Amino acid sequence: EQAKVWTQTARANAEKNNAQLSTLLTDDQIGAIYGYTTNEGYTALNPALRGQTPLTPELEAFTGHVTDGLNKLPAYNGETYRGTTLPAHILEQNQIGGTVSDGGFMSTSAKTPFDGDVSISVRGNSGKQIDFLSKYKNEAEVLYPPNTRFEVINRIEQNGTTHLLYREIP
Amino acid sequence: IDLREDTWTLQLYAQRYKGLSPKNSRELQLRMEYDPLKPNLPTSGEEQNSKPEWLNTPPCLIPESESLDKAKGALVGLAIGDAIGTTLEFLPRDKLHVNDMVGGGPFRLQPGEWTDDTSMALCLAESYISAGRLDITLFREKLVRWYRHGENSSNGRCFDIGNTTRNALEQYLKHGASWFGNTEPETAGNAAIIRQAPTSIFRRKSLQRTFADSDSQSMATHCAPESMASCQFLGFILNYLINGSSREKAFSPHVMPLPVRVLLINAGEYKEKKRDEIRSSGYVIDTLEAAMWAVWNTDNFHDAILLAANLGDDADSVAATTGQIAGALYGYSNIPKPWLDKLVQQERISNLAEQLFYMAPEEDF
Ligand SMILES: [Mg+2]
C-alpha cells in the first residue's frame, strides 16, 4: 500500500519535473528513492544501514531498490554541501588526511547550507541528483550511496562553523 | 572575486550570501542530522511537499502586448546577437572590432546569418510547439534533423556544432532515448545557455516549471551541473524580464538554490568588474557572467550586443546570451530595425516566439 503510494507519487512528480529521467527508473526503484525522502522511509532505513537497528529483509530489499535506481541516474560531478552537527569525538576524527565512510546514504544538496555547526563540502561523482522526484524540484538533493569513502582534504573554522572538504575516493 | 577560483575559496567567500539559499524542508533537515532519531538541527522547516516562497511567480504587471514584445525580443535578440557575435569568433580581444551586422567570421557568412546557437534554440522552440511541454526526445530528434539534414539552419547546412553537442547526438543515436551523458566538468560549455529563451517564454507563467525545464533542456546534451544551473538562473532572469520587471529588479539577488559560481553571479559580483576582468571563453560560467555584465553596463539593446560581441574569443556565445537578456529587457520593438531587416528568417523566428508566448500554460495550482 505504502510502496504503491510512493511509486505513484514519485512518478507524477518526475513526469512534471524531468519526464525523461523518469523512464530510467522501474516502479520499485522510483518508489524506493522517493520513500527515502519521506520521514517514515528514511528513519526506518538509514539507522539500519548505519548499524543502529537491524537490517531486516524488508529493509535489505528497500536499500537494493534505492541503489539500483541511483545507479541508473547520471553522475552529479561537482560540489555539494551537508550542514550538520557532529558529536565532538566524531568531529575530532575529521582531520586533514583522515578518511570517512558512512554506512548509510549521505544526503547533500547543491545549495549552500544554513544550519549545523559543521558545513561539509563534498566533491565526488557517485552522488545522484534526485530533486526531480520531489513535488517542486526545489531542494537540489544529491544522494551518495552507502559506504562511499571520502578523504578529508581541507578544514577551517570560519565564524562559528567548522568547514570540512571531502573528496570521494573511488 | 574571480569565478575561476577553486570552490573552497569561493564557498568561504560566499558565506556573506547565505540568505540567498532557501532553508531546508523539515524532511531534508532530518536527513542531514547526524542521528535522525536524536535530532540536533532546527525543526522549523516547511514540509517537503510545500511550495517555497522563491517559486511564487511574480505576476505580469505590464500589458500582455508588452510582455509579448519582450518574449519576441528574447528569441529574436538571441538570433541577432548570434549573427553579430560570430563575426569576431575565435579572435583575440580588440584585434578587430564589429559595429554592425556584417557576416563573415570563421564560417564566411552573409550578413544576418546565424549559427548553431539559434539553430538549437529553434529546435527547442519547435519541440515545445509540437509537444506542449519539454520533451527531451523530441528536442533531440529536432537537433538530429539540424545536424544530419540542415533543418533549422540559416544557410541549409549544419556548420558550427560543438563537440559536446555532437557527442550527445551521436550517443543518443547509438544508445537511444535513455542516454544521458556529458557530465564531466570539461563539458560545462555554453551550448545550453545559448538556446535557453524558448523555455523561459513557454514557462513565463511558472517559476517552478521554468526551473524544472531549464536544467532539463540543458540535459538533452549537457549534464554538467554548472550548465544545468546556469540555465536555471538565466531562465529566471528571462522570466522576470518577460513579465515586466525593471533591470534593477531582475538583476537583484534572488533566493534560489544554486552552485557557488552561479550563486555569486546571482549575488551580483560582476556588477563592478571592469572589461579586462570579464572572460568570453567557452566556459558556461564565464559566458553567463559576461552577458550579465554586458547588459548591466549598457543602456540599450544595440550597445549591449556590441559590448558583448567585441569581447572576442567565444564572442558568439556571450552575444547570443546577451541578446536573450537585452531582448527581454528592452523588447523586440527596441531592436534596431536595420538589424531585424537583415536577420535571416526574422519573421519566422518572431512568429515562433509569439506562438510560444500564447501557448504558455497557466501556473499550476
Ligand atoms: Mg555558434
Coordinates of C-alpha atoms and ligand atoms in Angstrom, one line a residue:
Chain A
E1 CA 0.0 0.0 0.0
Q2 CA 2.8 2.3 1.0
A3 CA 5.2 1.4 -1.8
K4 CA 2.5 2.0 -4.3
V5 CA 1.8 5.4 -2.9
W6 CA 5.5 6.2 -3.1
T7 CA 5.7 4.9 -6.7
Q8 CA 2.7 6.8 -8.0
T9 CA 3.6 10.0 -6.1
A10 CA 7.2 10.0 -7.4
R11 CA 6.1 9.1 -11.0
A12 CA 3.7 12.1 -11.1
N13 CA 6.5 14.4 -9.8
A14 CA 9.1 13.1 -12.2
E15 CA 6.8 13.3 -15.2
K16 CA 6.3 17.0 -14.4
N17 CA 10.0 17.7 -13.5
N18 CA 12.0 15.6 -15.8
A19 CA 9.9 13.0 -17.7
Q20 CA 12.9 11.5 -19.5
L21 CA 14.8 10.8 -16.2
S22 CA 11.6 9.0 -15.0
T23 CA 12.0 6.4 -17.8
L24 CA 15.4 5.4 -16.3
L25 CA 13.6 4.0 -13.2
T26 CA 11.4 1.0 -12.6
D27 CA 8.3 1.3 -10.3
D28 CA 10.2 -0.3 -7.5
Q29 CA 13.3 2.0 -7.9
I30 CA 11.4 5.3 -8.3
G31 CA 9.2 4.5 -5.3
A32 CA 12.1 3.5 -3.2
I33 CA 14.1 6.6 -3.8
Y34 CA 11.0 8.6 -3.1
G35 CA 10.4 6.7 0.1
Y36 CA 14.0 7.5 1.2
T37 CA 12.9 11.2 1.1
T38 CA 10.0 10.6 3.5
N39 CA 10.4 10.6 7.3
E40 CA 9.0 7.1 7.7
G41 CA 11.2 5.7 5.0
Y42 CA 14.4 7.5 6.0
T43 CA 14.0 6.7 9.7
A44 CA 13.5 3.0 9.1
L45 CA 16.3 2.6 6.5
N46 CA 19.3 4.8 7.3
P47 CA 19.6 3.9 11.0
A48 CA 19.7 0.2 10.0
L49 CA 22.4 0.8 7.4
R50 CA 24.4 2.7 10.0
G51 CA 24.2 -0.2 12.4
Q52 CA 21.8 1.3 15.0
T53 CA 18.9 -1.1 14.2
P54 CA 18.9 -4.4 12.4
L55 CA 18.9 -4.6 8.6
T56 CA 15.8 -6.8 8.1
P57 CA 14.7 -8.5 4.9
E58 CA 12.3 -5.7 4.1
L59 CA 15.0 -3.1 4.7
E60 CA 17.5 -5.0 2.6
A61 CA 15.1 -5.0 -0.3
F62 CA 14.4 -1.3 0.3
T63 CA 18.1 -0.4 0.1
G64 CA 18.7 -2.5 -3.0
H65 CA 15.9 -0.7 -4.9
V66 CA 17.3 2.7 -3.9
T67 CA 20.8 1.9 -5.0
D68 CA 19.6 0.1 -8.2
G69 CA 17.7 3.3 -9.1
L70 CA 20.5 5.7 -8.2
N71 CA 22.8 3.5 -10.4
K72 CA 20.7 4.4 -13.4
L73 CA 20.9 8.2 -12.9
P74 CA 23.6 10.5 -14.4
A75 CA 26.6 11.4 -12.3
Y76 CA 26.5 14.7 -10.4
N77 CA 30.1 15.7 -10.9
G78 CA 30.7 18.7 -8.7
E79 CA 30.5 20.1 -5.2
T80 CA 27.6 19.7 -2.8
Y81 CA 27.0 20.5 0.9
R82 CA 25.8 19.0 4.1
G83 CA 25.0 21.2 7.1
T84 CA 25.1 19.1 10.2
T85 CA 26.3 18.9 13.8
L86 CA 28.7 16.1 14.7
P87 CA 29.5 14.9 18.2
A88 CA 32.8 16.2 19.4
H89 CA 34.6 12.9 19.2
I90 CA 33.4 12.4 15.6
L91 CA 34.5 15.9 14.5
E92 CA 37.9 15.2 16.1
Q93 CA 38.2 12.3 13.6
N94 CA 37.7 14.7 10.7
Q95 CA 41.3 15.8 10.5
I96 CA 43.0 16.7 7.2
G97 CA 44.3 13.4 5.7
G98 CA 41.7 11.4 7.5
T99 CA 39.2 9.0 5.8
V100 CA 35.4 9.0 6.3
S101 CA 32.8 6.5 5.2
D102 CA 29.1 6.4 6.2
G103 CA 27.4 3.0 6.3
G104 CA 24.1 4.8 5.3
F105 CA 23.2 7.1 2.5
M106 CA 24.6 10.6 2.7
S107 CA 22.2 13.3 1.7
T108 CA 23.8 16.5 0.4
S109 CA 22.4 19.5 -1.5
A110 CA 23.8 21.7 -4.2
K111 CA 22.7 24.7 -2.2
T112 CA 24.7 26.5 0.4
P113 CA 23.8 25.1 3.9
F114 CA 22.3 27.2 6.6
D115 CA 22.2 25.1 9.8
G116 CA 24.7 23.0 11.6
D117 CA 27.9 23.6 13.5
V118 CA 29.7 21.8 10.6
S119 CA 29.4 22.6 6.9
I120 CA 30.7 19.7 4.8
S121 CA 31.7 20.4 1.2
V122 CA 31.6 17.2 -0.8
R123 CA 33.4 16.6 -4.2
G124 CA 32.7 13.4 -6.0
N125 CA 30.8 11.9 -8.8
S126 CA 28.9 8.9 -7.2
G127 CA 26.3 11.3 -6.0
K128 CA 23.0 11.5 -7.9
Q129 CA 20.6 14.4 -8.1
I130 CA 17.1 13.3 -7.1
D131 CA 15.2 16.6 -6.9
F132 CA 13.0 15.6 -9.9
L133 CA 11.2 13.2 -7.6
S134 CA 10.0 16.0 -5.3
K135 CA 6.9 17.9 -6.0
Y136 CA 8.6 21.3 -6.5
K137 CA 12.1 20.2 -7.7
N138 CA 13.4 22.8 -5.2
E139 CA 15.9 21.3 -2.8
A140 CA 18.7 20.1 -5.2
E141 CA 19.4 17.0 -3.1
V142 CA 22.3 15.0 -4.3
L143 CA 22.4 11.5 -2.7
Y144 CA 25.6 9.5 -2.1
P145 CA 25.2 5.7 -1.7
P146 CA 26.2 3.7 1.4
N147 CA 29.9 3.1 2.0
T148 CA 31.2 5.9 -0.2
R149 CA 34.7 6.7 1.1
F150 CA 35.9 10.3 1.4
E151 CA 39.3 11.8 2.3
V152 CA 39.2 15.0 4.4
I153 CA 41.4 17.3 2.2
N154 CA 40.7 20.6 3.9
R155 CA 39.3 22.1 7.2
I156 CA 38.9 25.6 8.6
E157 CA 36.9 27.2 11.4
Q158 CA 35.2 30.3 9.9
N159 CA 33.0 32.3 12.3
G160 CA 31.1 29.7 14.3
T161 CA 31.2 26.9 11.7
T162 CA 33.7 24.2 11.1
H163 CA 34.1 23.8 7.3
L164 CA 35.3 20.4 6.0
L165 CA 36.2 19.4 2.4
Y166 CA 35.6 15.8 1.4
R167 CA 36.9 14.3 -1.8
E168 CA 35.4 11.0 -2.9
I169 CA 38.0 8.2 -3.2
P170 CA 36.7 5.7 -5.7
Chain B
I1 CA 36.2 37.7 -6.8
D2 CA 37.5 35.6 -9.8
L3 CA 34.9 32.9 -10.5
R4 CA 37.7 30.7 -11.8
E5 CA 39.0 30.3 -8.3
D6 CA 38.6 26.9 -6.5
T7 CA 35.3 26.3 -4.9
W8 CA 36.8 26.1 -1.5
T9 CA 37.9 29.7 -1.7
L10 CA 34.6 30.7 -3.3
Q11 CA 32.3 28.9 -0.8
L12 CA 34.1 30.5 2.1
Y13 CA 33.8 33.9 0.4
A14 CA 30.1 33.2 -0.5
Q15 CA 29.2 32.9 3.2
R16 CA 28.2 36.6 3.2
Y17 CA 25.3 35.5 0.9
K18 CA 23.9 32.6 3.0
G19 CA 20.5 34.4 2.9
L20 CA 20.2 33.6 -0.8
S21 CA 19.8 29.9 -0.2
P22 CA 16.4 28.5 0.7
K23 CA 16.1 26.8 4.0
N24 CA 15.9 23.0 4.2
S25 CA 12.5 21.4 4.4
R26 CA 11.9 19.7 7.7
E27 CA 12.5 16.3 6.0
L28 CA 15.7 17.2 4.2
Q29 CA 16.9 18.7 7.5
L30 CA 16.2 15.4 9.2
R31 CA 18.3 13.6 6.5
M32 CA 21.2 16.0 7.4
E33 CA 21.1 15.0 11.1
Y34 CA 24.0 13.0 12.5
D35 CA 21.3 10.9 14.1
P36 CA 17.8 11.4 12.9
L37 CA 16.4 9.5 16.0
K38 CA 18.2 12.2 18.2
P39 CA 17.8 15.3 16.1
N40 CA 20.1 18.2 16.8
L41 CA 19.1 20.7 14.0
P42 CA 16.3 23.3 13.8
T43 CA 13.0 21.5 13.2
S44 CA 11.2 24.7 11.9
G45 CA 11.4 23.8 8.2
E46 CA 8.4 23.5 6.0
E47 CA 7.0 20.2 4.7
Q48 CA 9.0 18.9 1.8
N49 CA 5.6 18.8 0.0
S50 CA 5.1 22.5 0.1
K51 CA 5.6 25.4 -2.3
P52 CA 8.5 27.6 -1.3
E53 CA 8.3 31.4 -1.5
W54 CA 11.0 31.7 -4.1
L55 CA 8.8 29.7 -6.5
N56 CA 5.9 32.2 -6.2
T57 CA 5.8 33.6 -9.7
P58 CA 5.7 37.4 -9.7
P59 CA 2.6 38.5 -11.7
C60 CA 2.9 40.1 -15.1
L61 CA 2.2 43.7 -14.2
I62 CA 2.7 45.0 -17.8
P63 CA 0.1 44.7 -20.6
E64 CA 0.0 41.4 -22.5
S65 CA 1.2 43.0 -25.7
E66 CA 4.2 44.5 -23.9
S67 CA 5.1 41.1 -22.4
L68 CA 4.8 39.6 -25.9
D69 CA 7.2 42.3 -27.2
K70 CA 9.7 41.2 -24.6
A71 CA 9.2 37.5 -25.4
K72 CA 9.8 38.2 -29.1
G73 CA 12.8 40.3 -28.0
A74 CA 14.3 37.4 -26.1
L75 CA 14.2 34.9 -29.0
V76 CA 14.9 37.3 -31.9
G77 CA 17.5 39.0 -29.8
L78 CA 19.3 35.7 -29.3
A79 CA 19.5 35.3 -33.1
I80 CA 20.6 38.9 -33.6
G81 CA 23.4 38.5 -31.0
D82 CA 24.4 35.2 -32.6
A83 CA 24.6 36.7 -36.1
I84 CA 26.7 39.7 -34.9
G85 CA 28.9 37.8 -32.4
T86 CA 30.1 35.2 -34.9
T87 CA 32.0 38.0 -36.8
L88 CA 34.7 38.1 -34.1
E89 CA 34.6 34.4 -33.1
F90 CA 38.0 32.9 -32.1
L91 CA 39.8 36.3 -32.5
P92 CA 41.8 37.8 -29.6
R93 CA 40.0 40.6 -27.8
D94 CA 40.5 44.0 -29.5
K95 CA 42.4 42.8 -32.5
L96 CA 39.4 43.8 -34.6
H97 CA 36.0 45.3 -33.7
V98 CA 32.5 44.8 -35.0
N99 CA 29.9 47.6 -35.1
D100 CA 27.1 46.3 -37.3
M101 CA 25.6 43.1 -38.8
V102 CA 28.2 42.2 -41.4
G103 CA 28.5 38.5 -41.5
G104 CA 31.9 36.9 -42.0
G105 CA 33.5 35.1 -39.2
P106 CA 35.1 31.6 -39.4
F107 CA 32.1 30.4 -41.5
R108 CA 32.3 33.3 -44.0
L109 CA 28.7 34.1 -43.5
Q110 CA 26.4 36.6 -45.3
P111 CA 25.1 39.4 -43.0
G112 CA 22.2 38.2 -40.9
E113 CA 23.1 34.5 -41.0
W114 CA 23.1 33.0 -37.5
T115 CA 24.8 29.8 -36.4
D116 CA 24.3 26.8 -34.1
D117 CA 23.2 28.9 -31.2
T118 CA 20.0 29.9 -33.0
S119 CA 19.6 26.5 -34.7
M120 CA 19.5 24.8 -31.4
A121 CA 17.1 27.4 -30.0
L122 CA 14.7 26.9 -32.9
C123 CA 14.8 23.2 -32.4
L124 CA 13.8 23.7 -28.8
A125 CA 11.1 26.2 -29.7
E126 CA 9.6 23.8 -32.3
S127 CA 9.7 20.9 -29.9
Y128 CA 7.6 22.9 -27.3
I129 CA 5.2 24.0 -30.0
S130 CA 4.6 20.3 -31.0
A131 CA 4.7 18.7 -27.6
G132 CA 3.1 21.2 -25.3
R133 CA 5.9 20.5 -22.8
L134 CA 9.6 19.9 -22.7
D135 CA 10.1 16.6 -24.5
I136 CA 13.8 15.8 -24.4
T137 CA 13.5 13.1 -27.0
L138 CA 11.6 15.3 -29.5
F139 CA 14.2 18.1 -28.8
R140 CA 17.0 15.7 -29.6
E141 CA 15.2 14.5 -32.7
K142 CA 14.9 18.0 -34.0
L143 CA 18.6 18.6 -33.2
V144 CA 19.5 15.5 -35.2
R145 CA 17.5 16.8 -38.2
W146 CA 19.5 20.0 -38.0
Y147 CA 22.8 18.1 -37.5
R148 CA 22.2 15.5 -40.2
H149 CA 19.9 17.4 -42.6
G150 CA 20.4 21.1 -42.1
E151 CA 16.9 21.7 -40.9
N152 CA 16.6 25.0 -38.9
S153 CA 19.9 26.2 -40.4
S154 CA 20.4 29.8 -41.6
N155 CA 22.0 28.6 -44.8
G156 CA 20.8 25.0 -45.3
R157 CA 23.7 23.2 -43.6
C158 CA 24.8 22.3 -40.1
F159 CA 28.1 24.1 -39.8
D160 CA 29.1 25.2 -36.2
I161 CA 28.1 22.2 -34.0
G162 CA 30.1 22.0 -30.8
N163 CA 32.0 18.8 -29.9
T164 CA 29.9 18.2 -26.7
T165 CA 26.6 18.7 -28.6
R166 CA 27.8 16.4 -31.3
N167 CA 28.8 13.7 -28.8
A168 CA 25.3 13.9 -27.2
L169 CA 23.6 13.5 -30.6
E170 CA 25.9 10.6 -31.6
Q171 CA 25.3 8.9 -28.3
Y172 CA 21.5 9.4 -28.4
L173 CA 21.6 7.8 -31.9
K174 CA 23.7 4.9 -30.7
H175 CA 22.1 4.3 -27.3
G176 CA 18.6 5.6 -27.6
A177 CA 16.3 7.9 -25.6
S178 CA 17.6 6.8 -22.2
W179 CA 21.1 8.1 -22.8
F180 CA 22.3 10.9 -20.6
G181 CA 26.0 11.9 -20.5
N182 CA 28.5 14.7 -20.8
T183 CA 28.7 15.0 -17.0
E184 CA 32.3 15.9 -16.7
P185 CA 33.5 19.4 -15.9
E186 CA 35.3 19.8 -19.2
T187 CA 31.8 19.7 -20.8
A188 CA 30.5 22.8 -18.9
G189 CA 30.3 24.7 -22.2
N190 CA 27.8 27.2 -23.5
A191 CA 25.5 25.2 -25.7
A192 CA 22.6 25.1 -23.3
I193 CA 22.6 28.7 -22.1
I194 CA 22.8 30.0 -25.7
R195 CA 19.5 28.3 -26.6
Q196 CA 17.6 28.9 -23.3
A197 CA 15.0 31.6 -24.3
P198 CA 12.2 29.2 -25.7
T199 CA 11.9 27.6 -22.2
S200 CA 11.5 30.9 -20.4
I201 CA 8.9 32.1 -23.0
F202 CA 6.8 28.9 -22.8
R203 CA 7.1 28.8 -19.0
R204 CA 6.7 32.5 -18.5
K205 CA 3.8 32.0 -16.1
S206 CA 5.6 29.5 -13.7
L207 CA 8.9 29.9 -12.0
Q208 CA 8.7 26.2 -10.9
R209 CA 8.2 24.9 -14.5
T210 CA 10.9 27.3 -15.7
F211 CA 13.2 25.9 -13.0
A212 CA 12.3 22.3 -13.9
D213 CA 12.5 22.8 -17.7
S214 CA 15.8 24.8 -17.7
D215 CA 18.1 22.1 -16.3
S216 CA 16.2 19.5 -18.3
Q217 CA 16.7 21.3 -21.6
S218 CA 20.4 21.5 -20.8
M219 CA 20.4 17.8 -20.1
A220 CA 19.3 17.0 -23.7
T221 CA 23.0 17.4 -24.5
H222 CA 24.9 18.9 -21.4
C223 CA 24.6 17.3 -17.9
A224 CA 27.4 19.3 -16.3
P225 CA 25.8 20.8 -13.2
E226 CA 27.2 24.3 -13.9
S227 CA 25.5 24.2 -17.3
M228 CA 22.2 23.0 -15.8
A229 CA 22.2 25.6 -13.0
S230 CA 23.3 28.4 -15.3
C231 CA 20.3 27.7 -17.5
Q232 CA 18.1 27.8 -14.4
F233 CA 19.5 31.2 -13.4
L234 CA 19.3 32.6 -16.9
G235 CA 15.8 31.2 -17.2
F236 CA 14.7 33.1 -14.1
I237 CA 16.3 36.3 -15.3
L238 CA 14.3 36.0 -18.5
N239 CA 11.1 35.2 -16.6
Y240 CA 11.5 38.3 -14.5
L241 CA 12.1 40.5 -17.6
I242 CA 9.4 39.0 -19.9
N243 CA 6.9 39.6 -17.0
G244 CA 7.9 43.2 -16.9
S245 CA 10.4 43.7 -14.1
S246 CA 12.9 46.6 -14.2
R247 CA 16.5 45.7 -14.9
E248 CA 17.4 46.6 -11.3
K249 CA 14.8 44.2 -10.0
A250 CA 15.8 41.4 -12.4
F251 CA 19.5 41.8 -11.6
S252 CA 19.0 42.0 -7.9
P253 CA 19.9 38.9 -5.8
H254 CA 17.2 36.2 -5.8
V255 CA 16.7 33.4 -3.3
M256 CA 17.3 30.2 -5.2
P257 CA 19.4 27.1 -4.8
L258 CA 22.5 27.5 -7.0
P259 CA 26.0 26.0 -7.0
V260 CA 28.5 28.5 -5.8
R261 CA 29.8 30.0 -9.1
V262 CA 26.2 30.7 -10.3
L263 CA 25.3 31.9 -6.7
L264 CA 28.0 34.5 -7.0
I265 CA 26.6 35.7 -10.3
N266 CA 23.2 35.9 -8.7
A267 CA 24.8 37.9 -5.9
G268 CA 25.8 40.5 -8.4
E269 CA 29.6 40.1 -8.2
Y270 CA 30.0 41.1 -11.9
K271 CA 28.4 44.5 -11.5
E272 CA 31.5 46.4 -10.6
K273 CA 34.0 44.3 -12.7
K274 CA 36.0 46.0 -15.5
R275 CA 36.1 44.7 -19.0
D276 CA 39.6 43.3 -18.5
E277 CA 38.2 41.1 -15.7
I278 CA 35.5 39.6 -17.9
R279 CA 36.1 36.4 -19.9
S280 CA 34.4 35.4 -23.1
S281 CA 35.6 31.8 -23.1
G282 CA 33.7 28.6 -23.9
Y283 CA 33.1 28.1 -20.2
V284 CA 29.4 28.5 -19.2
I285 CA 30.2 30.4 -16.1
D286 CA 32.5 33.0 -17.9
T287 CA 29.8 33.5 -20.6
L288 CA 26.9 33.9 -18.2
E289 CA 28.8 36.4 -16.1
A290 CA 30.0 38.3 -19.2
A291 CA 26.4 38.5 -20.6
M292 CA 25.0 39.9 -17.3
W293 CA 27.9 42.3 -17.2
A294 CA 27.2 43.5 -20.8
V295 CA 23.5 44.2 -20.1
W296 CA 24.3 45.8 -16.7
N297 CA 26.9 48.1 -18.3
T298 CA 24.8 49.4 -21.3
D299 CA 21.6 51.3 -21.7
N300 CA 20.0 49.9 -24.9
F301 CA 19.9 46.8 -27.0
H302 CA 22.3 48.0 -29.7
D303 CA 25.0 48.8 -27.2
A304 CA 24.5 45.6 -25.2
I305 CA 25.0 43.4 -28.2
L306 CA 28.2 45.2 -29.4
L307 CA 29.7 45.3 -26.0
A308 CA 29.3 41.5 -25.8
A309 CA 30.4 40.8 -29.3
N310 CA 33.5 42.9 -29.1
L311 CA 34.8 40.8 -26.3
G312 CA 36.3 38.4 -28.9
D313 CA 37.2 34.8 -28.2
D314 CA 33.8 33.0 -27.9
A315 CA 32.1 36.3 -28.8
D316 CA 29.2 34.4 -30.4
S317 CA 28.1 32.7 -27.1
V318 CA 28.3 35.9 -25.0
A319 CA 26.5 37.9 -27.6
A320 CA 23.7 35.3 -28.0
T321 CA 23.2 35.2 -24.3
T322 CA 23.3 39.0 -24.1
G323 CA 20.8 39.1 -26.9
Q324 CA 18.3 37.0 -24.9
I325 CA 18.7 39.1 -21.8
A326 CA 18.8 42.5 -23.5
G327 CA 16.0 41.4 -25.8
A328 CA 13.7 40.6 -22.9
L329 CA 14.7 43.8 -21.1
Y330 CA 14.3 46.3 -24.0
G331 CA 11.8 44.3 -26.1
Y332 CA 11.6 43.5 -29.8
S333 CA 10.3 47.0 -30.6
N334 CA 13.7 48.4 -29.4
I335 CA 15.9 46.2 -31.5
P336 CA 17.4 48.2 -34.4
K337 CA 15.2 48.0 -37.5
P338 CA 18.2 47.5 -39.9
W339 CA 19.3 44.5 -37.9
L340 CA 15.8 43.0 -37.9
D341 CA 15.7 43.6 -41.7
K342 CA 19.0 41.8 -42.3
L343 CA 18.4 38.9 -39.8
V344 CA 17.8 35.7 -41.8
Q345 CA 14.3 34.2 -41.2
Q346 CA 13.5 37.1 -38.9
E347 CA 9.7 36.8 -39.5
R348 CA 9.7 33.0 -38.8
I349 CA 11.7 33.5 -35.5
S350 CA 9.4 36.2 -34.3
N351 CA 6.3 34.1 -35.1
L352 CA 7.8 31.1 -33.2
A353 CA 8.4 33.4 -30.2
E354 CA 4.8 34.6 -30.5
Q355 CA 3.4 31.1 -30.7
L356 CA 5.4 30.0 -27.6
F357 CA 4.1 33.1 -25.8
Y358 CA 0.4 32.5 -26.4
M359 CA 0.7 28.7 -25.7
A360 CA 2.4 29.3 -22.4
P361 CA 0.5 27.1 -19.8
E362 CA -1.2 28.7 -16.8
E363 CA 0.7 28.5 -13.4
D364 CA -0.1 25.3 -11.6
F365 CA -2.5 25.5 -8.6
Ligands
MG1 MG 27.7 29.5 -32.8

